């Protein structure tokens, strides 16, 4: 298992995709994997060692080019919307 | 007297807004409508069509 790194995962046939992190929520002993309001998985109990892992989607967002007029200049800026710079270079 | 009426009326706004859960029903309706729209959009992914 890999934490804090965006990795394809498959738990008992979940076949999801996203980064898995350590979670605080406590499942009941029989409760296999979590869910959200919109019926999208947002947690999973690790089957080997019984711990709850909060899964979150791989970071995505529009990339916009803040540029002045091409007649004024050719130097541009880039915005990576709703993402932290640590994973920007990827 | 006008100043007292105005201030007490403002206190009435505060009390009515706090006590009545339907004071902000318009903006809350807008937010709930957007939430229902997005939730239905997500649920449409679960649909076979």
């Amino acid at each position: 298992l890999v934490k804090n790194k965006c990795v394809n995962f498959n738990f008992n046939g979940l076949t999801g995709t996203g980064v898995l992190t350590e979670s605080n929520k406590k499942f009941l002993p029989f409760q296999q994997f979590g869910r959200d309001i919109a019926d999208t998985t947002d947690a999973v109990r690790d089957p080997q060692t019984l711990e709850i892992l909060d899964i979150t989607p791989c970071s995505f967002g529009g990339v916009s080019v803040i540029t002045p007029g091409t007649n004024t200049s050719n130097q541009v800026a880039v915005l990576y919307q709703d993402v932290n710079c640590t994973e920007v270079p990827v | 007297l006008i100043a007292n009426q105005f201030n007490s009326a403002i206190g009435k706004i505060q009390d009515s807004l706090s006590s009545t859960p339907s004071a902000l029903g318009k903006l809350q309706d807008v937010v709930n409508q957007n939430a229902q729209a997005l939730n239905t959009l997500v649920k449409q992914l679960s649909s076979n069509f």
Binding site: D36, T40, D42, T56, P57, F60, G61, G62, Q81, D82 | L24, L27, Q28, V31, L38, L41, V42, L45
Partner: peptide
């Protein structure tokens, strides 16, 4: 007044603090 399947929300340009200041 009171996760992502490809759906993104964008922040208002005038944040809540600047809206309140306006």
């Amino acid at each position: 007044v009171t996760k992502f399947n490809g759906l993104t929300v964008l922040p208002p340009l005038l944040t809540d603090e600047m809206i309140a200041q306006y």
